[PDB]
């Protein structure tokens, strides 16, 4: 047999496949085969026929497709152009299925930042130059809705940078009603916010400057308003603005999420800039004045005494069939996140689930069923299991449908449902070979294996993989979870060097049962190193005390947990105490820099890639959610005492590598610039590397270059 090579990892050689059906009905779904033909699939009859041929797509170089619910018009998307992590612009054509030619008479402007159908019928809503346009049919001129849209100043229907990256994680801010009656959009105002300007070089004689509205910690925030308009007669009274609750409307506040319940009912969630209070409001529609009213008896408050509300984001409620009560997961009395059922007041919440374990996410709620994720199985906090609960039945019930289907192979599941929950799909990511299956939906009996990955298994018969285990440490009433990767033919009578991979970000988890063939596998399989990941306090999915122990104090407990784990590993017996290294990425860079300069002498070399130097250089939302205001009255003391530049004198007897991208928009180059300047002023030697015109992800050949350089550094360190 042979071991893994670096070229197997740099270029895609062992990469699995996933099958996510593009559900259009409760019994049918579309797919794109390996022929550029868009094919419809029905389950009851089983017949599949091509609904869009490859010649039509090749005519316009179409790369994406979108089908109207009435199945009379399709839109083809080409000229893809990425903007941020989630946003992009593309050119759209419209093709008529009944007649067989492209619709003519009124073309769409290009480029378009976002486009969408309506749930019922075929009427189009799109965004062109920060304004929202509505078309009743693809053969009629558009009806403009908004006029104040301006580049980088006013945004309509799409979020700005902060909400796209920190709040919504989406590229859209417009919502259609369930029956396609109204349209709810959001106006973002960024006029007083300071801008960040960096240089982009490109293939030109003069480099240009990119300016982005970016609120740092303690700066001015965007101003958001929410409008709801009617689509049938959109000029009778015009857009109407939903009232803001008085309790929220006393200082700066954020907009969390919007969700439609019925045709005359909306739900909006609000957060104060002090992020330990959240408010849920339900707004109803009055026909006598064509208005939206948000009463006070329909106000729900959620406050966290020991920390921020929720985790990384705020839980989005799921509404029942009667549209009068809902479900939401939050912390219980003992400090464990669980499901609660709200009907009238937040004081009458009902604990449907209770236990030491946690609930991660909720997928579907129906008239007599409810689906969610949990770690309850065998006290392993790295496994995702999908469960099923019964609602409104004479006997109570609860069943785990993904527990013993494939035990030694699959312990990680993601569910994708259809209309009326008649059918759904399960995707398994690890720890065995990833699989994709489709289930009945009522008896939950497997029907058709959508993806098995036989080619990967056949190709992995002559490669010996490193062995992976997950175990637990108990130190000073603190439970740490560590995953260890060991080379093949491992004996405990010898000594091997050790590498630690750390992220440690708040509300995160790096110890999960997932399948991946990556750089770590190459290092363990060929170079004979032992790799480890450790999770301690400050991470998620284990409890409330563990999660909130890091509140208002970032950069203290993670380093202690890493050092404790390293010392226990050395005490285990098979680790060379003269060869230990650590590395991380974008929060693991911060932790790696703090741990390398802790003065304990445990580590020999360290690598930091795109780290955060100071917490005053990052976005307001994320920074202030876990730290607080940088004012002399609240938390200015810890801001100045938790910077990497304050440890510059402790890098003198270690090896350090610093890597960052020039055109990064998420973590700016100024962090690495300040780190380098601090190390220069302290007369400390280090190594550096930059990548020109590269974003946070370092896509392309930059990834190959980065991994080769890091491999050389690690080989020289442990020689």
């Amino acid at each position, epitope marked *: 047999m042979r071991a893994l090579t670096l070229k197997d990892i740099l270029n895609g050689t062992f990469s699995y496949k996933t099958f996510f059906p593009n559900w259009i009905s409760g019994q049918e779904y579309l797919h794109q085969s390996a022929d550029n033909n868009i094919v419809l699939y029905n389950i009851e009859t089983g017949q599949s026929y091509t609904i869009l041929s490859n010649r039509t797509m090749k005519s316009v170089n179409a790369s994406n497709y979108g089908l109207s619910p009435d199945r009379q018009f399709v839109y083809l998307e080409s000229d893809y152009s990425k903007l941020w992590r989630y946003s992009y612009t593309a050119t759209y054509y419209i093709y008529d299925l009944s007649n067989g030619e492209f619709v003519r008479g009124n073309e769409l402007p290009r480029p378009i930042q976002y486009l969408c159908w309506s749930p019922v019928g075929s009427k189009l809503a799109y965004v062109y130059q920060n304004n929202i346009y509505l078309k009743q049919r693809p053969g009629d001129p558009p009806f403009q809705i908004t006029f104040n849209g301006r580049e980088n100043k006013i945004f309509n229907g799409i979020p700005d940078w902060v909400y796209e990256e920190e709040m919504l994680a989406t590229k859209y801010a417009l919502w259609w009603s369930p029956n396609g009656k109204f349209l709810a959009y959001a106006e973002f105002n960024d006029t007083d916010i300071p801008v960040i300007a960096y240089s982009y070089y490109g293939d030109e004689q003069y480099p240009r400057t990119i300016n982005i509205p970016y609120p740092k910690a303690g700066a001015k925030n965007p101003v958001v308003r929410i409008f709801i308009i009617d689509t049938t*007669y959109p*000029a009778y*009274v015009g857009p109407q603005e939903v009232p803001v609750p008085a309790m929220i409307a006393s200082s700066d506040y954020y907009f969390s999420w919007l969700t439609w319940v019925t045709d005359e009912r909306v739900c909006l969630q609000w957060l104060k800039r002090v992020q330990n209070v959240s408010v849920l409001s339900i707004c109803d529609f009055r026909e*006598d*004045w*064509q208005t939206w009213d948000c009463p006070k008896t329909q106000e729900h408050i959620e406050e966290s005494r020991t920390g921020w509300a929720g985790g990384f984001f705020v839980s989005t409620p799921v509404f029942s069939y009667d549209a009068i009560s809902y479900y939401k997961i939050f912390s219980d009395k003992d400090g464990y996140k669980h499901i609660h059922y709200i009907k009238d007041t937040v004081e009458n919440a009902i604990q449907i689930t209770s236990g030491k374990w946690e609930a991660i996410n909720i997928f579907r709620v129906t008239q007599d069923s409810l689906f969610y994720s949990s770690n309850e199985f065998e006290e392993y906090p790295g496994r995702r299991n999908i469960y099923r609960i019964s609602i409104g039945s004479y006997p109570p019930s609860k069943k785990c449908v993904t527990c013993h289907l494939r035990k030694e192979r699959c312990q990680y599941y993601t569910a994708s449902f259809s209309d009326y929950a008649k059918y759904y799909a399960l995707v398994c990511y690890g720890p065995g070979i990833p699989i994709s299956t489709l289930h009945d939906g009522r008896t939950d009996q497997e029907i058709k294996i959508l993806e098995e990955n036989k080619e990967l298994e056949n190709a992995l018969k002559n490669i010996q993989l490193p062995k992976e285990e997950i175990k637990k440490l108990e130190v000073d009433e603190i439970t740490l979870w560590y995953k260890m990767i060991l080379p093949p033919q491992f004996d405990r009578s010898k000594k091997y060097p050790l590498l630690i991979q750390v992220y440690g970000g708040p509300c995160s988890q790096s110890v999960r049962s997932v399948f991946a063939v990556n750089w770590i596998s190459y290092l363990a399989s060929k170079e004979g190193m032992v790799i480890a990941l450790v999770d301690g306090r400050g991470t998620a999915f284990q409890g409330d005390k563990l999660l909130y122990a890091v509140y208002r104090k970032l950069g203290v407990y993670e380093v202690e947990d890493q050092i404790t784990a390293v010392r226990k590993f050395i005490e285990m017996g098979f680790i060379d105490e003269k060869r230990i290294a650590i590395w991380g990425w974008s929060y693991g860079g911060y932790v790696s820099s703090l741990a390398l300069a802790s003065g304990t002498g445990l580590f020999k070399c360290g690598i930091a890639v795109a780290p955060v130097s100071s917490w005053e250089y990052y976005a307001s939302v994320y920074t202030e959610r876990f730290m607080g205001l940088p004012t002399k009255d609240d938390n200015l003391e810890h801001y100045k005492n938790s910077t990497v530049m304050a440890r510059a004198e402790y890098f003198r007897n270690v090896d350090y590598l610093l890597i960052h991208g020039t055109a990064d928009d998420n973590v700016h180059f100024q962090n690495s610039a300040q780190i380098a300047k601090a190390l220069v002023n302290a007369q400390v030697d280090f190594q550096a590397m930059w990548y020109s015109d590269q974003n946070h992800g370092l896509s392309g050949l930059s990834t190959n270059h980065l991994y080769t350089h890091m491999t050389h550094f690690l080989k020289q360190c442990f020689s």
Partner: nanobody
Amino acid sequence: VQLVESGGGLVQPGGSLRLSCAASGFTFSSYAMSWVRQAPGKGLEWVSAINSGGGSTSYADSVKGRFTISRDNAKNTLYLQMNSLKPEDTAVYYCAKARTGWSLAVPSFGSWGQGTQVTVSS
């Protein structure tokens, strides 16, 4: 139900006019009333509203402080007085009857008549 409107016509800029509307069939003096307009090629745009009792009246943001409304239940008539005209009000006007007499209410798409054309130009 029958509604018939009259008045208006061609007018020079800076002028002033008044239009009248009369309805039959249903029971008057018990429902609120409103005035709507339809520009050529555009959609219906609500202009003003008046209470059943005649006390409180509401005017749109485009006709604020220039338009006045009145009603007389004795003769069952509605008057709209449009002063300080500008070359953007060329449209056909209609009177609309609401379905709520307990208070003011803007009718959405209830009873309709024929409408009266008004054009302002130099």
